[PDB]
């Protein structure tokens, strides 16, 4: 029960800290940063769907295994999770312009396993044990603000990935300078949105599992945004010098 939960959290935190350090130097080898020599590859679209599926599925499974699956605040938190992950699993990958037709299996296995552990941990902290997400929490500003940051970051992430989709007609592999929306300010507003999103999750849940996931998302996307930003500035002599990588007007 709680033994596995604490060990899952320790391992996720450890993995996030070590990922942060390494990703400042070597970006995760998918997308524009996919090189040779990363082992066997798999179809890119199937990898995205298969690797993300544990997050909505294992979360719902463990959620329902908790006594408090019938409580209002847990059910609102389930709504936020599934809003994200039904989009991440069954909208984003189906519409994406895939570029390279294959992607490294090792990266997709990491994501699959991460989502298994992270999905279970986050649901476990909500509906199991004592009810901490009472109706009093619904009247706590931390839940309200957290939920609004969740939805704001989610919305920005969705809007940002949609703009990217149209930079490629289906079947194309080209990269274009993204423009409009928040690209007016940062190279990776999709990453900005998702970072803010899971910070909002951490606030609304007030669980160690939510906090570790907000930390892990930052640990992973913040160095990736810097690598994307560096990539843009060397691929395009054209690229706006005023843009930051992730944080408007900062980095
Ligand atoms: N929570 C987390 O820790 C993580 C979650 N995510 C989320 O999942 C989503 C996918 O992330 P990720 O794939 O890294 O996002 P990217 O922005 O790197 O790529 C998303 C899609 O847009 C395409 N694309 C990106 N830039 C351009 C461009 N300049 N011109 C044309 N097409 C472009 C990519 O094609 P191509 O792949 O060929 O570059 C890909 O299909 C994001 O919303 C992200 O926040 C992903 C990683 C970690
Ligand atoms: C009370 C409500 C509870 C609901 C909780 C679970 C929600 C289930 C639905 C998930 C799909 C959401 C997807 C949001 C729309 C996707 C936006 C998008 O990507 O569209 C791009 C456009 O079609 C071209 O670029
Ligand atoms: C050199 C690498 C340093 C090691 C540390 C980095 C590990 C990569 C992140 C794993 C967590 C995944 C959790 C969130 C899912 C992200 C989706 C993804 O990872 O990309 C998949 C790929 O595009 C299609 O298979
Ligand atoms: C997909 C699911 C999306 C979920 C989106 C969640 C957004 C929550 C935002 C604000 C919370 C509302 C505050 C709740 C107000 C309760 C106040 C109260 O306790 O009632 C008044 C009392 O009767 C007088 O004494
Ligand atoms: C209950 C909620 C009801 C709505 C649930 C899902 C809507 C799915 C939204 C996605 C609609 C697909 C639109 C499309 O096909 O656009 C592809 C385009 O190539 C990309 O730019
Ligand atoms: C849900 C509200 C935000 C969804 C953003 C979105 O999917 O639409 C962006 C549009 O396709 C690009 O202009
Ligand atoms: C870009 C703007 C980002 C948005 C800015 C907001 C940042 C908030 C970050 C995390 C929420 C903090 C909550 C983390 C603490 C959760 C764990 C906890 O404290 O409760 C466990 C309890 O003590 C049983 O031991």
Author numbering: 3 to 253
What does the paper say about this structure?
Enzymes of steroid 5α-reductase family, which catalyze the 3-oxo-Δ4 reduction reactions, have critical roles in steroidogenesis. SRD5A1 and -2 are mainly involved in the metabolism of steroid hormones, whereas SRD5A3 converts polyprenol into dolichol for the early steps of protein N-linked glycosylation. Both SRD5A1 and -2 are endoplasmic reticulum membrane-embedded and utilize NADPH as a hydride (H−) donor for the Δ4 reduction reactions. In this work, we report the crystal structure of PbSRD5A from Proteobacteria bacterium and homology-based structural models of human HsSRD5A1 and -2. PbSRD5A shared 60.6% and 51.5% sequence similarities with HsSRD5A1 and -2, respectively.
After extensive crystallization trails, the crystals of PbSRD5A in space group C2221 yielded in several conditions under monoolein lipid using lipidic cubic phase crystallization method and diffracted x-ray to 2.0 Å resolution. PbSRD5A comprises seven transmembrane segments (TMs), with the N-termini located on the periplasmic side of the plasma membrane and C-termini on the cytosolic side. The connecting sequence between TM1 and TM2 adapted a short β strand (β1–2), which formed antiparallel β-sheets with the corresponding strand β3-4 linking TM3 and TM4. With most amino acids assigned in the electron density map, two omitted electron densities were clearly visible in the central cavity near the cytoplasmic side. NADPH perfectly fitted into one of the densities mainly coordinated by TM5-7 of PbSRD5A. NADPH formed extensive hydrogen bonds with N159, D163, and R170 on TM5, N192, Y193, and E196 on TM6, and T219, N222, R226, and H230 on TM7. The other elongated strip density was modeled with the crystallization lipid monoolein, whose alkenyl “tail” is accommodated well in the hydrophobic pocket majorly composed by the residues located on TM1-4. Considering of the hydrophobicity of steroid substrates and the orientation of NADPH, more specifically the position of nicotinamide, we hypothesized that monoolein probably occupied the steroid substrates binding pocket. In the substrate-free PbSRD5A structure, Y87 donates a hydrogen bond to a water molecule, which in turn hydrogen bonded with E54. Intriguingly, the movements of TM1s, combined with the observation of significantly large B factor value of TM1 in PbSRD5A structure, suggested that the TM1 may play important roles in the substrate entering and releasing.
